[PDB]
Design a protein around this ligand. Structure first.
Ligand SMILES: *[C@@H]1O[C@H](CO)[C@@H](O[C@@H]2O[C@H](CO)[C@@H](O[C@@H]3O[C@H](CO)[C@@H](O)[C@H](O)[C@@H]3O)[C@H](O)[C@H]2NC(C)=O)[C@H](O)[C@H]1NC(C)=O
Ligand code: 5JK
Ligand code: CA
Ligand code: NA
Ligand code: NA
Ligand code: ZN
Ligand code: ZN
Length: 795
């Protein structure tokens, strides 16, 4: 019935018994004397000189008595004030080559110090505002920023940090959610969120416990002052060896709240940032008192950033939809729409999307069916994600009705590539590198690293294990390149023209007469050397495919899908763009290396009134009129809606040359993607739901390209000694350009904007294709893993 000797105990007390732990207030279950015995505030949180050597008074919040280290409850400045010691922040940076842990410690503990809404740029305020944090940052390992997951809200990001999973996989797809199987709603406030049914994957504290590594309780009732959260972690670190946890978390609600109230750039942000730094100082001084400051690994990390958003910048659905009372909207910095009643027969989600599409010239949001959202968001494969999504412009809100000087000036939740949404990462301790800056990375990657830091085997997750090995002084995980599953055929020129009945045509009979004299036509030669700079992609599933060589490009032609899985080619800085001649406009040529039965047919395209075709290697970038004939082979053709061809042709005729001109040449790999069930993974044949009329030619859901060059732009892409530079895209293969409100204009006014929105990581394409890229480079495999997780954000 009492918390005497039980405050913040790690023991698991079940109902109906009254609790004394971290979360007892959140379940309204604390013992009667919890708030007096456990939440002591008397005399504050700092020893003063007059308290040194005091007789312990149990009413005090913390202690300055000679027994306080034994009881695990000294004020964090005890040794500084009472024993002549220095504050941790005033000590020189000194390298930590190996953990320096006291007797009985079997591994370096990990402490995760999570700060809500800590925008990356807040680090610019520097040592005068945040000296402790700046010391951690400069002395340890840090990134310029860390990318959160979408939506850029607390619960999805905190659970992603904990699991290594995208929200669509871990299940916490918003701060608010409705699950139609449960027929229940989850909210940041209330009891429903405590039900385990909502939470998938395997978070770090469970991974640890299952593997015999003791975890502290990661969560803190909001009533518990930050100073007490720090003192409680320090108390647990003082426990005997068989009770003491190896992994801990601290959470602060700041600077998110001040960001919401004052906006991210307010001068009012200074004080909350000082207060957080003061708490970091208490932790570090407290660790130093326990001789753990060169033993513990500390991660300082945020969940997302903060943008300027005021009530004046609100769009209302009632200004677009005449029947707004028939819908429910999850509102604000994103929109999710569903029917207010399932019994409604009037609600048509096609009419909703149409009514929200490009209706006002300065419209500050864009509707999408969830399968059409940028694939980089990985935000579709969950029954809790409504079919209808609104991507809201940064700085704006979307609300249902106008009834919904402002009370708030900041918010977050926007697209996770937006600058204002970026957050922070610092690692400090023996296992992290010393005085080391690392490139920006995604928070999905951290679970693997935290498992490594605790000697744990990670549960399956969406990180790329090894991509963050460069953060650590000592790695225990060494990644290995996956084995190729399907081996290609290398077919020669074996068939005659007469064997093909594809209905294809090239009246004039245009032909390179010289091909009949060219015995070495379509042999390897220097094709692989010039056009496959990083080796052939490996096929990681079982299929039948052919390698096809040409002067200007190489491809891996699927005999199952009747098109390339990948097409690879290099374009020099000085390459010339040429037009398609009049006689070749509608030219498609049989490929004498590939049987008629494993080829597409032009009659399917004639009969399909909605479908046209494009080419993966562009005829516009042919090296000669002779070589241009190769680009019209049936084995280079892919099905394309006419609307999409507007995009593709601009990319191929204009942008590839632009990129080559900007980057000292580029290597391009392009191909189809099939993701009809929107799971982010390559479809099997049975999962493909649309074909070209009357044929077995499957229709891609998307088209990708990976554009690689030398990071050292003084070297051409084909003679690069060092690190690589990559940008990639996964373009939606859509039968209209409704996504692009400016699409009636010249392609120079809209196509690039579309492509930037659909930027992608090479890893995203790998999941979607079952291909493995960059298999033959001069780079270490861990460096290649970092490259494959890179996202070009265009911010
Ligand atoms: C993000 O990571 C998660 C976790 O690894 C991936 O989800 C997992 O996906 C696999 C493959 O679809 C699921 O397992 C499969 O089960 C079927 C049986 O129906 C079997 O045929 C396969 O051999 C395989 O075992 C798995 O259940 C699922 N797990 C979780 C926890 O969600 C997800 O695919 C990743 N996302 C991306 C975009 O890579
Ligand atoms: C109101 C806030 C201050 C605190 C809210 C914390 C809340 C989200 C936490 C509390 C308990 C957590 C669950 C508990 O650790 C057990 C598991 C097992 C694990 O395998 C899946 C996650 C789950 C259900 C935790 C989810 C988060 C919970 C509910
Ligand atoms: Ca799929
Ligand atoms: Na057609
Ligand atoms: Na349009
Ligand atoms: Zn948050
Ligand atoms: Zn917030």
């Amino acid at each position: 019935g009492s918390c005497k000797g039980r405050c913040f105990e790690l023991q698991e007390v079940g109902p109906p018994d009254c609790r004394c732990d971290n979360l007892c207030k959140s379940y309204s279950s604390c013992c009667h004397d919890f708030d007096e015995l456990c939440l002591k505030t008397a005399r504050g949180w700092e020893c003063t000189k007059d308290r040194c050597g005091e007789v312990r008074n149990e009413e005090n919040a913390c202690h300055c008595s000679e027994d306080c280290l034994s009881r695990g409850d000294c004020c964090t400045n005890y040794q500084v004030v009472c024993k002549g010691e220095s504050h941790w922040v005033d000590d020189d940076c000194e390298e930590i080559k190996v953990p320096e842990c006291p007797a009985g410690f079997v591994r370096p503990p990990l402490i995760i110090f999570s700060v809500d809404g800590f925008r990356a740029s807040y680090m610019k305020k520097g040592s005068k505002v945040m000296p402790n944090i700046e010391k951690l940052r400069s002395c340890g390992t840090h990134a310029p920023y860390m990318r959160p997951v979408y939506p850029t809200k607390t619960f999805p990001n905190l659970y992603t940090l904990a699991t290594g999973l995208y929200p669509e996989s871990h299940g916490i797809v918003g701060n608010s959610m409705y699950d139609p199987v449960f027929d229940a709603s989850f909210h940041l406030r209330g009891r429903e969120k405590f039900n385990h049914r909502w939470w998938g994957g395997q978070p770090l504290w469970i991974t640890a416990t299952k593997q015999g590594v003791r975890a502290g309780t990661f969560f803190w009732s909001v009533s518990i002052p930050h100073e007490r959260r720090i003192l409680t972690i320090l108390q647990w670190l003082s426990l005997p060896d068989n009770e003491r946890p190896s992994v801990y978390a601290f959470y602060s609600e700041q600077p998110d709240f001040s960001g919401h109230k004052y906006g991210p750039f307010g001068p009012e942000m200074t004080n909350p940032l000082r207060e957080i730094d003061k708490t970091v100082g208490q932790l570090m001084d407290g660790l130093k008192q326990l001789r753990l400051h060169r033993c513990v690994n500390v991660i300082f990390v945020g969940d997302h950033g903060m943008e300027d958003v005021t009530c004046d910048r609100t769009e209302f659905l009632s200004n677009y939809l005449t029947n707004v009372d028939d819908i429910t909207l999850v509102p604000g910095t994103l929109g999710r729409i569903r029917a207010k009643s399932i019994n409604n027969s009037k609600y048509d989600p096609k009419t909703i999307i149409a009514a929200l599409t490009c209706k006002k010239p300065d419209q500050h949001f864009k509707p999408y069916m969830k399968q059409h959202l940028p694939k980089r968001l990985h935000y579709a494969n969950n029954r809790r994600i409504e079919d209808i999504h609104l991507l809201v412009d940064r700085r704006w809100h979307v609300a249902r009705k106008p009834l919904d000087k402002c009370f708030f000036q900041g918010d977050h939740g926007f697209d996770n590539k937006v600058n204002s949404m970026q957050t922070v990462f610092v690692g400090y301790g023996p296992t992290f590198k010393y005085r080391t800056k690392v490139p920006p990375f995604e928070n999905i990657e951290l679970y693997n690293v935290m498992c490594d830091l605790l000697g744990l085997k990670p549960a399956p997750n969406n990180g790329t294990h090894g991509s963050l090995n460069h953060l650590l002084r000592t790695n225990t995980f060494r990644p290995t390149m996956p084995d190729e599953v399907s081996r290609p055929n290398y077919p020669g020129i074996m068939y005659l023209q007469s064997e093909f009945d594809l209905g294809c045509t090239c009246k004039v009979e245009p032909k390179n007469k010289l091909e009949e004299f060219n015995k070495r036509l379509h042999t390897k030669g220097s094709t692989k050397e010039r056009h496959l700079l990083y080796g052939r992609p490996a096929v990681l599933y079982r299929t039948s495919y052919d390698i096809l060589y040409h002067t200007d490009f190489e491809s891996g032609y699927s005999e199952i899908f009747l098109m390339p899985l990948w097409t690879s080619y290099t374009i020099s800085k000085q390459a010339e763009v040429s037009s398609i001649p009049e006689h070749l406009t509608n030219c498609v040529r049989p490929d004498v290396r590939v049987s008629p039965g494993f080829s597409q047919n032009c009659l399917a395209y004639k009969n399909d009134k909605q479908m046209s075709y494009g080419f993966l290697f562009p005829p516009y970038l042919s090296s000669s009129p002779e070589a241009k004939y190769d680009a019209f082979l049936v084995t280079n053709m892919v099905p394309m809606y006419p609307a999409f061809k507007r995009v593709w042709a601009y990319f191929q005729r204009v942008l590839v040359k632009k990129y080559a001109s900007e980057r000292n040449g580029v290597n391009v790999i392009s191909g189809p993607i099939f993701d009809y069930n929107y799971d982010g993974l390559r479809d099997t044949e049975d999962e493909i739901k649309q074909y070209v009329e009357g044929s077995s030619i499957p229709v891609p859901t998307h088209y990708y390209s990976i554009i690689t060059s030398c990071l050292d732009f003084t070297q051409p892409a084909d003679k690069c000694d060092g690190p690589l530079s990559v940008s990639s895209f996964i373009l939606p293969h859509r039968p209209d350009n409704d996504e692009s409100c400016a699409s009636s204009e010249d392609e120079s006014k809209w196509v690039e904007e579309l492509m930037k929105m659909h930027t992608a990581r090479v890893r995203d394409i790998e999941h979607l294709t079952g291909l493995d890229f960059y298999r033959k480079t001069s780079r270490s495999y861990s460096e290649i893993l970092t490259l494959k997780t890179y996202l070009h954000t265009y911010e």
